[PDB]
Design a protein around this ligand. Structure first.
Ligand SMILES: OC[C@@H]1O[C@@H](O)[C@H](O)[C@H]1O
Length: 326
C-alpha cells in the first residue's frame, strides 16, 4: 500500500543494490524508477506514489537481454521517459560476443501502465559514429528536444565525453553531435579519465547538466555544466564547466563514490530532489564493476543565494526530511 503525500520524507538507502537510479514523476500521481541491477542483465521497473514508497514497491522485470547478438551483453542504466503520449526507455547495451561493446537502444510502450504494458524494441539509437556509447538522456526546451549522452571519441584519451545534439523524434538525432565536456581536471581522472551519466535540471533561467567522473569506486564524484537557457545549446562555448567537483565522497557521513544521479521533484513540483547512488564503505574487494553495493538514495537540491545549485554532501544513512510544504 503506497498512500500519497505532499511531504517528502525518506529513509536512506531507499533501494539497496540498485545503481544508476532514474526517477521520473509522471502526471498520474506516480514516481517511476529504473536502474542498473547488479547482474547487468535486465531492465526492472517499479512505481510508487511517494519517493520513500519506492523502497517497498514491487519491481517488475520488463525486459531481459537477448540470448545472442545485439542487446545480448551488459545492460546498463535505463531511463524511462514519457514523450508525446508514449513511454520510452533509453538504455545502453553490449553484445553477446562483446558484453562491453556498448551502444544506445530504445524501447517503447503505448499502454498507459508501463509495468503491465507491452514493450517493443526500437533498435539502436545511432550517433555520428560507432563507438562506446552509453548513458543517453533526453530533455526538451523551447520546443526543441535534445539528446545528451556519453561516448568514446577514438581521437581523445578518455573513456567517454559528454555530447549534445538536436533530436528528430524520440528515436533519432539530427545534425552533428557537439562535445560539451571532456576530462580535464585531476578529479575527473582518478582511476580512469571519464565523463558519463549526464543528467539535466532546468531552473532559474539556466540549464544545468551534472555528470559523473573518475572510476566507479570511492573516487566517483560529480561535476557541473551550466548554460543560459537562451543560449545556443549546440555551441560548446555556451557551456561553462565548474572547476571543482560539485559532489563527492564524505567520510564523516560514511558515503563513498556518489554519482550517476537523476533529478525529480516533490509531488507539488516545488522542490528539486537529486536521486543518486553511493556505497556506505570505502574499500572494495575484486573489480569495482561487480561490487553490487551502490545503493539508491535521495536528498534535496539546495539553491545558493545567486541561483546556482548547492548539492552539499551526501547525507548520512537514516531518516531525511526533504520537504514539508509551508
Ligand atoms: O553507466 C555505464 C557504467 O555502468 C554503470 O553500471 C555505471 O553507472 C557506469 O560506470
Amino acid at each position: 500500500p503506497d498512500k500519497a503525500d505532499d511531504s517528502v520524507i525518506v529513509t536512506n538507502p531507499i533501494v539497496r543494490r540498485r545503481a544508476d537510479p532514474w526517477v521520473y514523476r509522471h502526471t498520474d500521481g506516480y514516481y517511476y524508477m529504473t536502474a542498473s541491477v547488479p547482474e547487468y542483465d535486465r531492465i526492472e521497473l517499479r512505481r510508487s506514489r511517494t519517493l520513500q514508497g519506492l523502497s517497498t514497491a514491487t519491481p517488475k522485470t520488463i525486459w531481459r537481454r537477448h540470448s545472442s547478438g545485439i542487446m545480448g551483453g551488459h545492460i546498463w542504466a535505463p531511463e524511462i521517459h514519457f514523450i508525446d503520449g508514449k513511454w520510452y526507455i533509453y538504455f545502453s547495451a553490449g553484445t553477446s560476443t562483446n558484453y562491453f561493446d556498448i551502444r544506445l537502444y530504445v524501447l517503447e510502450c503505448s499502454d498507459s501502465n508501463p509495468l503491465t504494458g507491452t514493450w517493443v524494441e526500437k533498435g539502436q539509437l545511432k550517433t555520428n559514429w560507432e563507438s562506446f556509447t552509453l548513458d543517453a538522456t533526453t530533455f526538451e526546451h523551447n520546443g526543441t528536444r535534445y539528446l545528451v549522452w556519453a561516448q568514446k571519441d577514438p581521437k581523445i584519451a578518455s573513456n567517454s565525453n559528454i555530447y549534445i545534439a538536436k533530436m528528430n523524434g524520440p528515436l533519432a538525432i539530427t545534425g552533428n553531435q557537439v562535445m560539451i565536456s571532456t576530462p580535464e581536471y585531476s578529479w575527473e581522472k582518478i582511476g580512469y579519465a571519464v565523463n558519463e551519466g549526464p543528467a539535466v535540471l532546468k531552473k532559474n533561467g539556466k540549464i544545468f547538466i551534472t555528470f559523473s567522473a573518475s572510476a566507479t569506486d570511492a573516487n566517483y564524484c560529480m561535476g557541473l555544466l551550466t548554460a543560459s537557457d537562451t543560449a545556443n545549446l549546440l555551441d560548446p562555448k555556451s557551456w561553462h564547466k565548474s572547476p571543482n567537483p560539485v559532489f563527492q565522497s564524505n567520510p564523516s557521513t560514511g558515503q563513498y563514490g556518489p554519482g550517476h544521479n537523476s533529478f525529480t521533484t516533490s509531488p507539488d513540483g516545488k522542490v528539486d530532489i537529486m536521486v543518486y547512488h553511493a556505497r556506505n564503505y570505502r574499500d572494495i574487494t575484486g573489480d569495482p564493476l561487480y561490487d553490487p553495493n551502490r545503493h539508491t538514495r535521495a536528498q534535496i537540491v539546495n539553491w545558493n543565494a545567486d541561483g546556482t545549485p548547492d548539492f552539499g554532501i551526501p547525507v548520512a544513512d537514516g531518516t531525511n526530511v526533504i520537504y514539508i510544504p509551508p
